[PDB]
Amino acid sequence: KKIGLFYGTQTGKTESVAKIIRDEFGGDVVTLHDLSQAEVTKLNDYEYLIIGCPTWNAGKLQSDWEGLYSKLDDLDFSGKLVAYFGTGDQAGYADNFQDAIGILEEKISQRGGKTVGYWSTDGYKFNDSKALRNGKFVGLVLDEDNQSDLTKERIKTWVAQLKSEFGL
Numbered sequence: 001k002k003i004g005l006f007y008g009t010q011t012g013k014t015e016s017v018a019k020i021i022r023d024e025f026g027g028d029v030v031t032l033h034d035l036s037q038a039e040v041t042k043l044n045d046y047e048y049l050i051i052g053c054p055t056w057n058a059g060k061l062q063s064d065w066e067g068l069y070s071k072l073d074d075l076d077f078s079g080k081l082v083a084y085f086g087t088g089d090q091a092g093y094a095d096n097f098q099d100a101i102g103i104l105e106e107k108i109s110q111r112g113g114k115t116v117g118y119w120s121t122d123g124y125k126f127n128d129s130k131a132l133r134n135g136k137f138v139g140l141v142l143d144e145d146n147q148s149d150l151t152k153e154r155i156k157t158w159v160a161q162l163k164s165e166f167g168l
């Protein structure tokens, strides 16, 4: 079973996290795709996906994901299991915390993808997020700006969860 992890990054934090996620899964189970360089239609090449995106400029997708968002309408994610992760800043942007993964999950689910890897809100403080579904985040949310001391344990916990939900 091959997992494709597709990310965008401006300041490198989501990329750093992507690499830890890859390591934590082990071997060559996860292949990384930076959408500054990767073709978006490679999303079709996997039945198991991990979508990484930080939120920028008070509620916007990271620029690589923003530029490719319209192309999601052309893809069929039916039959795929999709997980999400984001980096964000809950102190600076409490009204838009992790919006970007929420935006992406809404569209990918509309295009047939099935979300796995929902994540508790416990231990975050924010006002609003477009990433909430029935009181859980759509996926792992990291905050390297305020909570960098929690990132490693959070990733370990989530990868264990994903191994179960993906049926590895």
Ligand SMILES: Cc1cc2nc3c(=O)[nH]c(=O)nc-3n(C[C@H](O)[C@H](O)[C@H](O)COP(=O)(O)O)c2cc1C
Pocket: 008, 009, 010, 011, 012, 013, 014, 015, 054, 055, 056, 057, 058, 059, 060, 062, 087, 088, 089, 090, 092, 093, 096, 097, 098, 099, 144, 145
């Ligand atoms: C100008 C600016 C705007 C930001 N806007 C948001 C936001 O709306 N929501 C959020 O959750 N985080 C926001 N952040 C936090 C970034 O998402 C966070 O620093 C993230 O780790 C950046 O990921 P990257 O290094 O992969 O680009 C913002 C950061 C900056 C500096």
